[PDB]
Amino acid sequence: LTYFSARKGKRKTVKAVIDRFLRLHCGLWVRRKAGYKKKLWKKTPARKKRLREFVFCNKTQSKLLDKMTTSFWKRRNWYVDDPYQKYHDRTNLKV
Amino acid sequence: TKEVYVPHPRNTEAVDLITRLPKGAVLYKTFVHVVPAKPEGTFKLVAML
Amino acid sequence: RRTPPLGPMPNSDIDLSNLERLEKYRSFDRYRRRAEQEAQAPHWWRTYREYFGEKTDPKEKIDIGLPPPKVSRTQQLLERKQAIQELRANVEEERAARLRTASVPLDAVRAEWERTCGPYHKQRLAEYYGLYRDLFHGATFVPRVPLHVAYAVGEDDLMPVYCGNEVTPTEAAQAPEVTYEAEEGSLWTLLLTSLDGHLLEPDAEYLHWLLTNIPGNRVAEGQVTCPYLPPFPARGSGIHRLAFLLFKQDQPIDFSEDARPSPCYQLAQRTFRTFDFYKKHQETMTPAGLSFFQCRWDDSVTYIFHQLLDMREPVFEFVRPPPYHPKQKRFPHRQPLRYLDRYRDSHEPTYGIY
Amino acid sequence: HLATAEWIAEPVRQKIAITHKNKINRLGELILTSESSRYQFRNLADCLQKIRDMITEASQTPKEPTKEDVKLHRIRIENMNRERLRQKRIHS
Amino acid sequence: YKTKPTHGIGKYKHLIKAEEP
Amino acid sequence: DPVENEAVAPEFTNRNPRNLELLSVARKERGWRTVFPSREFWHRLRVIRTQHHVEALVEHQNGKVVVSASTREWAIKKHLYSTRNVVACESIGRVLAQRCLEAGINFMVYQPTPWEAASDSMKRLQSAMTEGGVVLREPQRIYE
Amino acid sequence: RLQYLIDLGRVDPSQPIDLTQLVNGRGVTIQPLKRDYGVQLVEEGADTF
Amino acid sequence: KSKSKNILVRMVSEAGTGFCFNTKRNRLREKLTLLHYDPVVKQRVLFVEKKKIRSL
RNA sequence: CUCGGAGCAGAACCCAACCUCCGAGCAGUACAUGCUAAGACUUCACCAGUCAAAGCGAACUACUAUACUCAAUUGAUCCAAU
Ligand SMILES: [K+]
Ligand SMILES: [Mg+2]
Ligand SMILES: [Mg+2]
């Protein structure tokens, strides 16, 4: 990671993360399952359905992904007709 | 619990076993159960039409 | 570490020295038959029956019915064997059985069954339906006096009441035609109770009909202690049980305390418990016959509630327990995106302060 | 009040009372309730749409044979056996 | 289970003659 | 001025043992997949054939017999040349079907063995039950 | 939010309301540099408007 | 890693929807024509092999 | 040098040696091995892997039938072909 850029002296974003992960404003990260497009002819339907799921990351992964991205990517966005709009805020979450 | 074990008649292997047993001999196996805790539901007054 | 068995272990009486000379099952049916027998015996280890079998009381059920009829087995057996010989001697009978064209007359079978095994089959069936558990708090009786209840439907049809057959409230709008075999000079009491109809109290019943001091089998001449009320099973409440209990009175009884005003359209007055009623009259009264049917709500029950009872019709609904979900966690690792919907109250977008 | 409502047609009035007899109370008022939204507006709009659907169904008089529900299949068998037990008077 | 009194309630191969090819 | 008759408990108590069964919402005993026969039923037809007699039982999964028809009964025996042949088995079905309707039992499961199911006796007993009105398959439980 | 702004005199309903009047009343904060294209009127609070 | 006895082929729906699924068949046997469920039309339709994906 | 079964490791789980033994890198049958969805398991992390009620759509008139048989029978990301 680049903590201080040579031209602006600012922290940089690792663009590899942006290409693979979605960050919900609540702090959760969404990813796809590795191999979900690989050798489907030898995989059962139950396994293939599991591979198509959009799953969450754990605390350690989320903390790492937050460090690898700048504040711009953690802001609240209001995209029109956003599919993931509902998942940005948590509900009935105790601790 | 421990229950008497009667296999399916289509189960060729198990059926051959029991037919060769001596008369008066019953096989036993351990079974695991789930005793339902709650009822399926309850009738509730919904209206007074 | 080992522990000795608390009793005789299975497969213990088998002599393992003479295994080759011991007889084998050889058939699946012979093993299953022995297997079913062993499963029924009491065991000192944990069993399925222990956790799922209904906990019957150890003391036997008190019999409160009429005495069994006395029959001469020797004469009865002689006549029965003679009849079989006559039937088997007929050549036309043998060819019909050999060619599988013979049949039994169901009408005659029921008439004989009603005289012989009918009472015990009705008792076994009444116990299954829970009548003895609810009506007499576990005490059972053999319905030795066949009771024939029929609801006149139309002008040319009848709806017979047997022992759990379904009869609709519309068919039971008017009092049924009750006929039983009774000697001259005897007295009987006939009642109709809804075991499950009661709305306010779970353990109570509704007395739909009460006829007392019936001379012989002339039900029309009995005293109308309680007028007839058609069944009113509430909508969505399920299938109810209505039982006709015939009683044999030893001597004339006074039911002034049990008298209900004519007409009786107050559910508080209809509230009735058979156990309490019989207990006070047990000394001079014995259960003789039994019939019952199963009744669910139909459009005619609305008439009973609105007009006869002058009340709003209560509707019920079968409600299932809410679905279980584990406690929501801040990071639901490896859970699909629909995890969050499981814990969402509303499906409409929320915007918070904005 | 369904019967008094003159904005609905008389034949339609009589057919709605039969089809939706379970939604008419003792006084004769057809009661419709919607609780599927947070907003009173959408709840009312749903209730009003149900009224418009009732009138459309009654006037359409559809003769298409609808597919039988599972719960109805069992009641059909039970009704058949109840009619099969019906007897006739020995001397009518 | 080994320590319990019901140990070996499911034994059955001592009731069958051994099979030899 | 509340009406006394309108005093209704918020929860209705129906003690009819068959109530939930007839609504097809009661639990069936699922499981026992490695043994025979299944328990996933409310009522079952069970036929007992002996050396001299033929008996058919309708029993609830809890083990209680509801209705029964046996050639040991004099009502049936007196009309049968033989109580051990195919005719006896067909007759038992016809008698049992009528008793089932009178008890309110319209559905049950029949769990024959491969050889029993193929037997001519059991095929005639099953035809007798279906012609009599009883359906030898049970409706699916409603979970939702 | 719109009703709350009107009740407090921060937005004047006697004149036409547009983006300028909402911004001058500090009702909404628009960021054109962050690809904001304006305001979307959402139905939250319709019952009490 | 062993003698190639089977091959993977693409089965194309004959309904014209374009729905395809991959099946394994023996190399020496004739082209497969199968009755397979087509989600687009929501009922079973005849499929015909068009191409060989790879050797198994 | 990866994967599976057994002993060591006797009874919940786990457990090493250039320790002791045997195997795998497929094949065969289906063509709804369709879709979807509670609740769980998990090779000590992650990745990956595993089992599933209900429901939709089918099948069905009893082929131990609706998550095929089989123990392992296998390969991430980028990229390339389409
Ligand atoms: K009740
Ligand atoms: Mg783990
Ligand atoms: Mg399922």
Which of H49, F124, D73, F8 lies closest to C314, judged by CA?
F8
Give yes or no for a contact between C253 and C281, defined as CB atoms under 8 angstroms apart.
yes
3-state SS class at C124: helix
**CA B22 centroid distance within chain:** 24
User: For tokens 């009964």, what's the residue?
Assistant: F73
> What distance in angstroms lies between residue A49's CA and the mean position of ligand 3's atoms?
16
State which residue has its Cα closest to the C1' atom of I11.
E2
Query: Minimal Cα distance from C1: which residue of E?
Result: E3
Query: Can you spell out the DSSP letters for C286-335?
Result: EEEEEEEEEE---HHHHHIIIIIS-SPPEEEEEEPPPPP-PPP-SS-BT-
Experimental method: cryo-EM
Which residue type sits at F54?
A: V
Task: Give the separation between CA F85 and CA F92, rounded to whole angstroms.
Answer: 11
Residue found by looking up tokens 């049916």 in the block: C29
Straight-line distance from the first to the last Cα atom of chain D, in angstroms, rounded to the nearest whole number: 45
Are the beta carbons of C248 and C181 closer than 8 angstroms? no
Q: Cβ distance C25 to B26 under 8 Å? A: no
Is F3-143 a domain of CATH 3.30.420.80?
yes
Ligand nearest to the CA of C200: 1
| Crossing angle between the packed helical segments F120-131 and F86-103, to the nearest 10 degrees | 30
Tokens at C231, concatenated = 């069944």
Q: Is C25 exposed, middle or buried (0-12, 13-18, 19+ CB in 10 A)?
A: buried
Residue A22 CA, ligand 3 centroid: distance in Å:
33
CB of C214 within 8 A of CB of C253? no
Give the tokens for residue D88.
């006739």
Look at residues F47, F48, F125 and name the one whose alpha carbon lies nearest to residue F86.
Answer: F125
Task: Indicate the fold that domain D1-60 takes in CATH.
Answer: Double Stranded RNA Binding Domain (3.30.160)
CA atoms within 13 A on the CB side of F38: 16
d(CA C224, CA C113): 33
Q: Following DSSP, what letter does each residue of C65-90 receive, concatenated? A: SPPPPP--HHHHHHHHHHHHHHHHH-
Give the span between the Cα atoms of C208 and C244, in whole angstroms: 10
Shortest CB distance from B43 goes to which of F6, F11, F27?
F11
Considering only alpha carbons, which residue of chain D is nearest residue B48? D25
CA–CA gap between residue D44 and residue G46 (Å, rounded):
13
Q: Report phi then psi at G6, rounded to 5.
A: -70, -40
Report CA(F5)–ligand 1 centroid distance (Å): 14
* Amino acid C103 CA to nucleotide I4 C1' distance, rounded Å: 64
Closest Cβ–Cβ partner in C35, C52, C236 for B26: C35
Strand B42-48, strand C314-319: pairing: antiparallel
d(CA F91, CA F76): 8
| Entry resolution (Å) | 2.8
* Residue C138 exposure: Cα atoms within 13 Å on the Cβ side: 8
Altogether, the residues listed in chain E come to a count of 21
Give, to the nearest 10 degrees, the angle between helix C73-89 and helix C91-98: 80
HSE on the CB side for F85, CA within 13 Å? 15
Write the CB contacts of A74 (distance below 8 Å, at least 6 apart in sequence): A23, A25, A66
CA of E9 to C1' of I8 (A): 29
Ligand 1 centre distance from Cα of residue C192 (Å): 16
Does C306 contact B at CB distance below 8 Å? no
Q: How far apart are CA C295 and CA C168, in angstroms?
A: 6
Long-range contacts of H43-48 (CB under 8 A, 24+ apart): H45/H13, H45/H14, H45/H15, H46/H14, H47/H11, H47/H12, H47/H13, H47/H14, H47/H21, H48/H11, H48/H12, H48/H14
Take residue C251 and report the two structure tokens written for it.
């001597």
Rounded Cα gap, residues C10 and C23, in angstroms? 18
- CATH number for the region C122-308 comes to 3.90.280.10
Task: Name the residue of chain C whose CA is nearest to A90's CA.
Answer: C340
Dist CA F59 CA C281 (whole Å):
35
CA count, 13 A, side-chain hemisphere, C212: 20
Give the pair of three-digit tokens for residue C204.
């109570």
CA-based nearest residue to F94, from F60, F133, F59, F67: F133
Q: Distance (Å) from CA A32 to C1' I3?
A: 26
**β strands within chain C, DSSP E:** 147-153, 157-161, 163-166, 177-180, 187-194, 205-215, 223-226, 240-249, 271-272, 285-295, 314-319
Terminal-residue alpha carbon distance, chain B: 51
H or E element, residue F86: helix F86-103
DSSP C107: H
In the reported structure, the alpha carbon of residue F30 is separated from the centroid of ligand 3 by a whole-number distance in angstroms of 13
Is the CB of residue F103 less than 8 Å from the CB of residue F67? yes
Mutation target to probe the A interface, by most A beta carbons within 10 A, among G33, G34, G39, G42 is G34
Residue C166 and residue B3: Cα distance in Å, rounded?
A: 38
What nucleotides of chain I have any atom within 7 angstroms of a protein Cβ?
11-12, 25-41, 45-55, 57-58, 61-65, 67-68, 74-77
Query: What b-and-e string marks burial along F37-53, b requiring 16 or more CB atoms within 10 Å of the CB?
Result: bbebbbbbbbbebeeeb
Neighbors of chain G by Cβ distance (3+ pairs < 8 Å)? A, C, D
DSSP label at residue C193 = E
Contacts of B20 (CB under 8 A, 6+ apart): C24, C25, E16, E17
Q: Which residue, chain included where needed, has tokens 């929860």?
A: F11
The structure tokens 């460090």 sit at: A67
* Burial (0-12, 13-18, 19+ Cβ within 10 Å), C289: buried
Residue closest to I51 C1′ by Cα: A46
Taking contacts as CB-CB distances below 8 angstroms, the residues of chain C near E1 are: none
D40: which chain G residues are within 8 Å (Cβ-Cβ)? 47
Fold of the domain spanning H5-56? Rubrerythrin, domain 2 (2.20.28)
CB atoms under 10 Å from CB of D86, counted, come to 13
Chains A and B touch (3+ CB pairs under 8 A): no
A78 close to H (CB below 8 A): no
Residue D25 burial by CB count (10 A; 0-12/13-18/19+): exposed, middle or buried? middle
Count A/C contacts: CB-CB distance under 8 Å: 50
State the greatest distance between any 2 C-alpha atoms of chain B, in Å, as a whole number.
68
Token pair listed for F83: 């109580």
Instruction: Count other Cβ atoms within 10 Å, centred on residue C144.
Output: 21
Q: Touching check for E17 and chain C: CB below 8 Å?
A: yes
Specify the DSSP class assigned to residue G35.
T
Element spanning D30, H or E: none
Angle at H37 between CA H33 and CA H40, to 5 degrees: 115
Plot region of C11 (φ>0 → left; ψ -120 to 50 → alpha; else → beta):
left
CA of B26 to C1' of I64 (A): 20
Q: How many CB atoms within 10 Å of residue E1?
A: 8
* CA gap F77, F96 in Å, rounded: 14
CA distances (Å), origin D13, targets B19, D21, D28, D33, E1: 73, 11, 12, 19, 73
- Please count the other Cβ atoms lying within 10 Å of the Cβ belonging to residue F87: 24
Q: How many Å does it take to go from CA E2 to C1' I10?
A: 11
* Long-range contacts (CB closer than 8 Å, 24 or more residues apart) made by C50-56: C50/B1, C51/B1, C51/B33, C51/B35, C52/B33, C52/B35, C53/F62, C53/F63, C54/F62
- Strands A29-32 and B42-48, sheet pairing: unpaired
Q: Which of D74, D84, D85 sits opposite F24 (nearest CB)?
A: D74
Q: What angle do CA C150, C152, C158 make, to 5 degrees?
A: 65
Q: Are C339 and A56 in contact (CB under 8 A)?
A: yes
Interface subset of G 10-49, CB within 8 angstroms of C? 42, 44
By the 10 Å C-beta count (0-12 exposed, 13-18 middle, 19+ buried), F25 is classed as middle
Nearest nucleotide, C1' to the C-alpha of F118?
I62
With CB atoms and an 8 Å threshold, state whether F113 touches C117.
Answer: no
Whole-angstrom Cα distance, residue F117 to residue C41? 29
CA C51 – ligand 1 centroid, Å = 28
Looking up tokens 């049809």 gives C157
CB-CB neighbors (< 8 A) of B49 in chain D: 22-26, 31
Residues with a beta carbon under 5 angstroms from ion ligand 1: C 198; F 13
- The 8-class DSSP code of residue C340 comes to G
